[PDB]
Scaffold this active site. Structure first.
Site, PDB file in Angstrom:
ATOM      1  N   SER A  42      38.718  36.317  39.272  1.00  0.00           N
ATOM      2  CA  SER A  42      39.379  37.598  39.565  1.00  0.00           C
ATOM      3  C   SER A  42      40.790  37.486  40.071  1.00  0.00           C
ATOM      4  O   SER A  42      41.434  38.509  40.297  1.00  0.00           O
ATOM      5  CB  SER A  42      38.607  38.431  40.574  1.00  0.00           C
ATOM      6  N   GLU A 142      32.896  38.047  30.528  1.00  0.00           N
ATOM      7  CA  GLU A 142      33.065  36.744  29.852  1.00  0.00           C
ATOM      8  C   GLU A 142      34.052  35.796  30.532  1.00  0.00           C
ATOM      9  O   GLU A 142      33.856  34.572  30.463  1.00  0.00           O
ATOM     10  CB  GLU A 142      33.440  36.944  28.392  1.00  0.00           C
TER      11      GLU A 142
END
Length: 265
Positions: A42, A142
């Protein structure tokens, strides 16, 4: 010795650790596996928000984005709560940075637009900042799943630290947009046990975390000393030896940051 301490941590956590702190006025760069690739996870959401801010007038923040059940495909603490109303671009940026919201980041990638659901344009934004290393190839979920060593969806501690330096400390963004990104990172809710845990309370810390499969745990931060001297800190880790379901270990990042903080004090 710093490299010896980082190697000790790798053994303790059965991990691969990468650390980069760019050189400043009076400190040399701190580097450990700094040019090895690690998954973004992230952490890409910080430059993603920068890309979206840069690409648009500030009041694009007020544009409402609608989305559906089939768009919730990943950990999305905010976008799941707001699915019945839509979210503004500003709300999406807030959720992407402060809650690491996967749907919010996927919607921001689509807003940026172009091939690969926005991933090519995101990578192009990094190229514009001189980063010829990083690459984003997938969206959530993914992007957190590539096998250890695969170069898809990777950055390096060195590369992402230089990007973050330009975004927060440099002039990549105009001051108003720079402040929006800085404040969202300052208000992050997911980083208390990572770089923040390694710096004393009188240092300011802003950050963006990432966590993935194969025991992936990252944190990228800008820190300010009690006298206002800023440093950029990138810490990345994985635990390939435990396979896909290896637990991420935040404590590794806290200890690495504590070692860095010792040098910067």
């Amino acid at each position: 010795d710093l490299a010896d301490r980082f190697a000790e941590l790798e053994r303790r956590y059965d991990a691969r650790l990468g650390v980069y702190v760019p050189a400043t006025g009076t400190t040399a760069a701190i580097e450990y596996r700094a040019d090895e690739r690690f998954a973004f996870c992230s952490t890409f959401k910080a430059p993603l928000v920068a890309a979206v801010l840069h690409q648009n007038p500030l009041t694009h923040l007020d544009k409402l984005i609608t989305y559906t059940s089939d768009d919730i495909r990943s950990i999305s603490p905010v976008a799941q709560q707001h699915v019945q109303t839509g979210m503004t671009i500003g709300q999406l940026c807030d959720a992407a940075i402060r809650y690491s919201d996967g749907t919010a980041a996927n919607l921001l990638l689509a807003d940026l637009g172009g091939p690969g659901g926005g991933t090519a344009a995101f990578t192009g934004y990094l190229r514009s900042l001189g980063d010829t290393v990083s690459r984003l190839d997938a969206e959530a979920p993914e992007l957190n799943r590539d096998p250890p060593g695969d170069e898809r969806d990777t950055t390096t501690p060195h590369a992402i630290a230089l990007v973050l330096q330009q975004l927060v400390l440099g002039n990549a963004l105009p001051p108003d947009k720079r402040a929006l990104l800085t404040d969202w990172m300052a208000r992050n809710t997911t980083g208390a046990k990572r770089i923040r845990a390694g710096f004393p309370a009188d240092w300011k810390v802003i950050d963006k975390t990432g966590t993935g499969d194969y025991g992936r745990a990252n944190d990228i931060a800008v820190v300010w000393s009690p006298t206002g001297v800023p440093y950029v800190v990138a810490v990345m880790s994985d635990r390939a030896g435990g396979g896909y379901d290896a637990e991420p270990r935040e404590a590794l990042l806290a200890e690495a940051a504590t070692c860095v903080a010792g040098v910067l004090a």
